[PDB]
Amino acid sequence: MPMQMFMQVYDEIQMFLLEELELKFDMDPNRVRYLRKMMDTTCLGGKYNRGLTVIDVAESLLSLSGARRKRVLHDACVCGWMIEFLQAHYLVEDDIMDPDVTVQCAINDGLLLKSWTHMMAMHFFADRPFLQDLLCRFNRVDYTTAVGQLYDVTSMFDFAEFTLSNYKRIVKYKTAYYTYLLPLVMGLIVSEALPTVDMGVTEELAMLMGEYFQVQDDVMDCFTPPERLGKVGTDIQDAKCSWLAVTFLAKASSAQVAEFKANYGSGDSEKVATVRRLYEEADLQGDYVAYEAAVAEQVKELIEKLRLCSPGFAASVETLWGKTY
Template sequence: MMDYNVPGGKLNRGLSVIDSYMLLREETEVDDEDFYLACVLGWCVEWLQASALVFDDITDNAYTRRDSLCWYKLPTVGMSAINDGVLLKCHVQAIIKRYFKEKIYFLNLMELWNEIGLQTAMGQMLDLITTHTGAKDLARYRIQGYRRMVKYKTSYYSFYLPVACALLLNGAKLSDYVELNNVLIEMGVYFQIQDDYLDCFGDPEVIGKVGTDIEDYKCSWLIVQAMELANENEMKILCENYGKSDPQCVAAVKNVYKELDLQV
């Protein structure tokens, strides 16, 4: 299960821990132990990412991930993937305790991971509430709500967490880097906008998955922008077709996106 879900991606989040740490230490020599600990934290971020993707694929009814079947789609797995996702996340705490319990920053590190776990779960809740709860109403899809959802669901664990881990490993206090937090959150929003665009217009052979944001009625950047730019007729087309799996409905939505110059 771990071999199937943890490796295989671009490893950007895990490598960000190492890259950030090496930049912080560029004036001093990094010994093998410190470099190894940076690698451990990098893999912890990748384990958290794997857990998030397992849950995401189930809630989105996704089919492929990283050029392979989603874990829950395997005949021998099914909904037991829910427990596997929990197991992946729980292992992170065990790994951190094993390698860092004697470090002076151990409690701060654990507090960071607990906080990020809560924020990510809140982001997932916002996504689920927006997508699956109540009557479908595209008028609710506004940039303020989109940014709030992305901030919690993506930015904190994908951008802030790797850098924060590197700072703690280097002996820094996170309270001294509040502005850095804000910058990393904005980077996460930019990243998610790119991801939303590729979900719709990217080549599945390149991005490693079949995008389903339109079919799943997702609050993506594209639909948020379209709702701000569309005229009355385009708005009618979006409301009639968004959230439907019929290929003709999906094509109709994409055509509106193109008319609004959202495809570049």
């Protein structure tokens, strides 16, 4: 029953936001329905992985610590939709990168989605003692993601930054903080059990799980065909600082690097095929198995350190880890 409640609080959040526009913001029904359709389009359809993690962390900490239960579980669902709305905000900003009225509405949609995370928090948490701390940690993670997108975009402008340490810097800020650390931290806040956990182990686990997720995502972007991946792999044509690129450059010959540099970042189908040819011949999908196994072991062990002082919290972090593993 965590999903059926998550979808039920969505109707409660959407009803407040649209009524507030109708009553306080002088909005007409035509635009209200236009915003209802836009909100449903961008925020619904996904797996709600980030949003459901907030609920799982919250329900684990109240059971393993009367009216306080109903409030904490409700606050968790609101935090779950804050992240999901924030994810819809990031998705809309991606479509802009790739009198034009459809581009005006797209830019405006991204602003409203971002502001809607503030409006639902300022309303449902107005009398909560954590509203200020929630907005600060939320904005800091949002700022963190924007910095990570700067690292990722300029990863080939200023192959010097094609290193494993810089790759983990990109994964840390672009993905890890808002996908893995933010849902866990929000579950701790609404459960009022933030100081009871070791934030170092928690932060370290979030970096490893985002690292495990991004490497797996990079290999799928290259080797998985389009209809099986759900999209078209574009990392090679985009010259992205992928795990395959930084691992190839470390174990390639002097010419294989030259052939890589002469083919990486091109849109030609056969240059991209030449890059996949180089990836295949270096046995990178064998190092990928070993690299992921080492990460998964660091995850299994860092979960155990956290359960010494946070027994129930580790159960939720272990549940989230299974979704990526």
